[PDB]
C-alpha cells in the first residue's frame, strides 16, 4: 500500500510562504443519532399459545422481566438521544420572505412549503438515498392479515412476537427543529444560542466570522461577490455529489441493516431443535406423553431463552455505541452550528466559519463551511527591524520582503503595508535578537508637523 505522495517543504531560516488568495469549501459530516426501537414478548416468542410451555416457563424465574426492562431502557434512551441532539432551540425562528442574504443562496437548504413535508431539497435527497426496511412502527396487522402476494419478513417477525415501536418525534418535527436552527443561524448568527436572537446583516456576520479566523474584515467586503460565488458553487457540488453517489450514507445504512439482520436471526432461530426431536411445539405436545414432552419442551425453552438473551446483550452494546455517537452529534451542533469553533479538525477541515444542520434518517448531516488558503508565494522574513538603535516588532503580523523593500503584512493573507510606528512596537536594542535587519520605520507625525 501507498501512504501518500512524498513532499519536502523548502525550509530555510529566512524564508516564509504567505497565501495570496483563498477558497470556500463545504464538506459533509454524517453521524448516527438513534436506532430502531424494539419490544419482544418473551412468552409468545418462546412458547406462543402453549399453556404447558407457559407453565414450564414460569419455573425459570424473572428471565423475562429483566429482558423487558433492558429493551424498555433502550427504547427510552433512543428518544432521549434525538431530543438532546435536535431540541437545542427554545423558539421556532422563521426566515423572512425576502431571500437576499448578501448574495448567498440558501434556497437548497431552506424548506420549501410546496411539498407535503416541509423539508429542503438536500433533506429530500438524503431521505431518498437511505433505503429503509419500512418497519412496523406504522400499523401493519391489517396488511399482515390480508394475504396478498407472498409473506413478508416483517409479517413473520410480528407473528413471532417481535414488535417495533415508533419514535416520539416524527420526521416533520425533526425538520421543523432543523429549520428553526437554520433560520436562527442565518438571521441572528451566534446570538440566538446565548440568549435572544439579535439580528445582523449576513455580510457583517461573515465579517465577524473572518475576524474569528484571523483575517481582517476588509478582505470580505472587497471580495464579497467572489466569496458568494464560491459558496454557491460549493453548495451545487454538494447537491451533484448527493445526486450521483449514494455511498456517503453508509453509517445510517449500517444502522438500518444491523437492526434488520438481528431480528432476522432471532426469527430464524425458531427453526432449530436444540437437541430435541422437533422444533415445532405442537408436534412435541401431540406426539409424546407428559414427561417426555416436558423434557423436549424444556430443551426448546432453554435454546430459545439463550437466543433471546444473546439478542438483548448485542442490543445493549449497540445502544452504548449509538449513545456515544449521539453525544458527539449534540456537541457538534452546540459548537459548530450555534457558534464558531477554534478547535482544529473539529467542525470540518480548514478554518471553520459556519455550519448547517440537515436531518437524515436515523441521524444528522452537517454542512461545514471552512476557509482554505489557496495560492502562496515565497518571501523573505525577519524577526525584528533595527532602526535608530531600537528593535521594532510587529503588533499583529509578519515582516516580509519582495527583494528590495520591507513590508508588514497579516499572516493568513498577503496585504503588504508600509512599516510605521503605528503597526510596530519597540522593545530593547539590536544586540540581542538573532536575525535582526536594518531598515527605516515611517513616522506619520513628521510630515504633518513640517507642513
Ligand X SMILES: *[C@@H]1O[C@H](CO)[C@@H](O[C@@H]2O[C@H](CO)[C@@H](O)[C@H](O)[C@H]2NC(C)=O)[C@H](O)[C@H]1NC(C)=O
Interaction site with ligand NAG (CB under 6 A):
10, 12-13, 17, 98, 100, 105, 107, 142, 376-378, 386, 438
> Per CB under 8 A, does 21 bind a copy of itself?
no
Separation of alpha carbons 250 and 105, rounded Å: 29
Q: How far is the CB of 163 from another protein (least distance, A)?
A: 6
Separation of alpha carbons 255 and 258, rounded Å: 6
| Residues 362, 256 contacting (CB under 8 angstroms) | yes
Instruction: Give the residue among 341, 379, 291 at the shortest CA–CA distance from 52.
Output: 291
Instruction: Give the residue among 77, 86, 127, 88 at the shortest CA–CA distance from 324.
Output: 77
Distances (CA, A) of 105 to 99, 192, 196, 218: 8, 21, 25, 22
Which residues inside 215-274 make contact with ligand X, applying CB under 6 A?
Answer: 226, 229-230
Choice from 221, 246, 251, 442 touching a copy of itself (CB under 8 A)? 221
Q: How far is the CB of 140 from ligand NAG (least distance, A)?
A: 10
Strand locations in 402-444 (E):
406-409, 417-418, 424-426, 437-438
Which residues inside 12-51 make contact with ligand X, applying CB under 6 A?
Answer: 21, 23
Q: How far is the CB of 218 from ligand NAG (least distance, A)?
A: 19
- Kindly write out the interface string for residues 188-207 of this chain, putting x where it contacts a copy of itself by CB under 8 A and - elsewhere: --xx-xxxx-x-xx-xx--x
| Grid cell locating 402 | 519582495
Which residues inside 385-444 make contact with ligand X, applying CB under 6 A?
Answer: 402-405
Instruction: Give the residue among 85, 77, 83 at the shortest CA–CA distance from 37.
Output: 77
> Per CB under 6 A, does 380 bind ligand X?
no
Choice from 41, 60, 94, 236 touching a copy of itself (CB under 8 A)? 60
Task: Return the one option of ligand X, a copy of itself, ligand NAG, none that residue 105 interacts with (CB less than 5 to 8 A, by type).
Answer: ligand NAG
Convert 235-283 into a string of H (helix), E (strand) and C (coil): HHHHHHHHHHCCHHHHHHHHHHHHHHHHHHHHHHHHHCCCCCCCCCHHH
Q: How far is the CB of 91 from ligand NAG (least distance, A)?
A: 14
Separation of alpha carbons 93 and 176, rounded Å: 10
Q: How far is the CB of 253 from another protein (least distance, A)?
A: 10
Judged by beta carbon, residue 96 or residue 250, the one nearer ligand NAG is: 96
| Residues 395, 425 contacting (CB under 8 angstroms) | yes
Judged by beta carbon, residue 243 or residue 375, the one nearer a copy of itself is: 375
Q: How far is the CB of 347 from ligand NAG (least distance, A)?
A: 25
| Residues 441, 422 contacting (CB under 8 angstroms) | no
> Per CB under 6 A, does 309 bind ligand X?
no
Choice from 51, 62, 446, 451 touching a copy of itself (CB under 8 A)? 62
**437-438 and 385-387 beta bridge pairing:** parallel
Judged by beta carbon, residue 173 or residue 426, the one nearer another protein is: 173
Judged by beta carbon, residue 378 or residue 427, the one nearer ligand NAG is: 378
Judged by beta carbon, residue 69 or residue 405, the one nearer ligand X is: 405
Judged by beta carbon, residue 155 or residue 219, the one nearer ligand X is: 219
Separation of alpha carbons 352 and 331, rounded Å: 15
Judged by beta carbon, residue 214 or residue 383, the one nearer another protein is: 383
CA dihedral of 257, 258, 260, 266, whole degrees rounded to 10: 160
Separation of alpha carbons 168 and 315, rounded Å: 20
Q: How many other C-beta atoms are found inside a 10 Å radius of the C-beta of residue 344? A: 10
| Residues 399, 387 contacting (CB under 8 angstroms) | no
Q: How far is the CB of 432 from a copy of itself (least distance, A)?
A: 5
**Residue with grid cell 437437541, as numbered in its chain:** 275
| Residues 383, 436 contacting (CB under 8 angstroms) | yes
Q: How far is the CB of 13 from ligand NAG (least distance, A)?
A: 4
> Per CB under 8 A, does 265 bind a copy of itself?
yes
Task: Return the one option of another protein, a copy of itself, ligand X, none that residue 404 interacts with (CB less than 5 to 8 A, by type).
Answer: ligand X
Q: Which residues bind ligand X (CB under 6 A)?
A: 21, 23, 226, 229-230, 402-405
Amino acid at each position: 500500500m501507498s501512504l501518500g505522495a512524498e513532499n519536502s517543504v523548502a525550509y530555510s531560516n529566512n524564508s516564509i510562504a504567505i497565501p495570496t488568495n483563498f477558497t470556500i469549501s463545504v464538506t459533509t459530516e454524517i453521524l448516527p443519532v438513534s436506532m430502531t426501537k424494539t419490544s419482544v414478548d418473551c412468552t409468545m416468542y418462546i412458547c406462543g399459545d402453549s399453556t404447558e410451555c407457559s407453565n414450564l416457563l414460569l419455573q425459570y424465574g424473572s428471565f423475562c422481566t429483566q429482558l423487558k426492562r433492558a429493551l424498555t431502557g433502550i427504547a427510552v434512551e433512543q428518544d432521549k438521544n434525538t431530543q438532546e441532539v435536535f431540541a437545542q432551540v427554545k423558539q421556532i425562528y422563521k426566515t423572512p420572505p425576502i431571500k437576499y442574504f448578501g448574495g448567498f443562496n440558501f434556497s437548497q437548504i431552506l424548506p420549501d412549503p410546496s411539498k407535503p413535508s416541509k423539508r429542503s431539497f438536500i433533506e429530500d435527497l438524503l431521505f431518498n438515498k437511505v433505503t429503509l426496511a419500512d418497519a412496523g412502527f406504522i400499523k401493519q396487522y391489517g396488511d399482515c392479515l390480508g394475504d396478498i402476494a407472498a409473506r413478508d419478513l416483517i409479517c413473520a417477525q410480528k407473528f413471532n412476537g417481535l414488535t417495533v415501536l415508533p419514535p416520539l418525534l416524527t420526521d416533520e418535527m425533526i425538520a421543523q427543529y432543523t429549520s428553526a436552527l437554520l433560520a436562527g443561524t442565518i438571521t441572528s448568527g451566534w446570538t440566538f444560542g446565548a440568549g435572544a436572537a439579535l439580528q445582523i446583516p449576513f455580510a457583517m456576520q461573515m465579517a465577524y466570522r473572518f475576524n474569528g479566523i484571523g483575517v481582517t474584515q476588509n478582505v470580505l467586503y472587497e471580495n464579497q461577490k467572489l466569496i458568494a460565488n464560491q459558496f454557491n458553487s460549493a453548495i451545487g457540488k454538494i447537491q451533484d455529489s448527493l445526486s450521483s453517489t449514494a455511498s456517503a450514507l453508509g453509517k445510517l445504512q449500517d444502522v438500518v441493516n444491523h437492526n434488520a439482520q438481528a431480528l432476522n436471526t432471532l426469527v430464524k432461530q425458531l427453526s432449530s431443535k436444540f437437541g430435541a426431536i422437533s422444533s415445532v411445539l405442537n408436534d412435541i405436545l401431540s406426539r409424546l406423553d407428559k414427561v417426555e414432552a416436558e423434557v423436549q419442551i424444556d430443551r426448546l425453552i432453554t435454546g430459545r431463552l439463550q437466543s433471546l438473551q444473546t439478542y438483548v446483550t448485542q442490543q445493549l452494546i449497540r445502544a452504548a455505541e449509538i449513545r456515544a455517537s449521539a453525544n458527539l452529534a449534540a456537541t457538534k451542533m452546540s459548537e459548530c452550528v450555534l457558534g464558531q469553533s477554534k478547535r482544529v479538525d473539529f467542525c470540518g477541515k480548514g478554518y471553520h466559519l459556519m455550519s448547517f444542520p440537515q436531518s437524515a434518517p436515523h441521524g444528522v448531516v452537517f454542512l461545514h463551511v471552512t476557509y482554505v488558503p489557496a495560492q502562496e508565494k515565497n518571501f523573505t522574513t525577519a524577526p525584528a527591524i533595527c532602526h535608530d538603535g531600537k528593535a521594532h516588532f510587529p503588533r499583529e503580523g509578519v515582516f516580509v520582503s519582495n527583494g528590495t523593500h520591507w513590508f508588514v503584512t497579516q499572516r493568513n493573507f498577503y496585504e503588504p503595508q508600509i512599516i510605521t510606528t503605528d503597526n510596530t512596537f519597540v522593545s530593547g536594542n539590536c544586540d540581542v535578537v538573532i536575525g535582526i535587519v536594518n531598515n527605516t520605520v515611517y513616522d506619520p507625525l513628521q510630515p504633518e508637523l513640517d507642513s
